[PDB]
Amino acid sequence: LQVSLAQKNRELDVKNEQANQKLKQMVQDQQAAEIKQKDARELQVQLDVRNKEIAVQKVKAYADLPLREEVEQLENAANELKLKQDEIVATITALEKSIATYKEEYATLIRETEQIKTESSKVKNKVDRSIALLDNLN
Secondary structure: OHHHHHHHHHHHHHHHHHHHHHHHHHHHHHHHHHHHHHHHHHHHHHHHHHHHHHHHHHHHHHHOOOHHHHHHHHHHHHHHHHHHHHHHHHHHHHHHHHHHHHHHHHHHHHHHHHHHHHHHHHHHHHHHHHHHHHHHHO
């Protein structure tokens, strides 16, 4: 029973490194996405200026009613954007999910590690407990 438990302790080391490895991939696979997020978040913010800007002038000039044509221009500009926003808000969701699953996955790979660590433990005790038995029997 000493041989087998030293064996299974091996089946664990590997089981654990195959996961302890893949888990490293997750960090350099989720930190990646997060970057886009934080990055592309700067854009949603940045371009937020424009809509809020182009917004007020619309209000003003529309009441103040080249103005006409100039206003035709604000309406288009705010359109170029309105579109380019739905553009990044879709880009944000892209990661939002992509990244939120890496978590649900990390957490899962964590459970696998936790279960492994414990097994290894419950085996060490049994092995330690066999070294005592062998010795008293000998």
